[PDB]
Each structure stands twice: as C-alpha cells, then as structure tokens.
Design goal:
This protein is mostly helical and 25 residues long. The chain is rod-shaped. Helices cover 60% and strands 0% of the residues. This is Cystic fibrosis transmembrane conductance regulator.
C-alpha cells in the first residue's frame, strides 16, 4: 500500500458508520 492508506480507510469507515447503529437489531 505505497499509495492506498487513506483511500482504504474511507471504505473501512463507510461501513463502521453504516454498521455503527444498525447491527443492534
């Protein structure tokens, strides 16, 4: 990842957020 360290988190957070208050069913 010589040039994909931040472009990767944008995808990891896009989920944790959409998963932060939704999994708790």
């Amino acid at each position: 990842m010589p040039g994909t360290i931040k472009e990767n988190i944008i995808g990891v957070s896009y989920d944790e957020y959409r998963y932060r208050s939704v999994i708790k069913a």
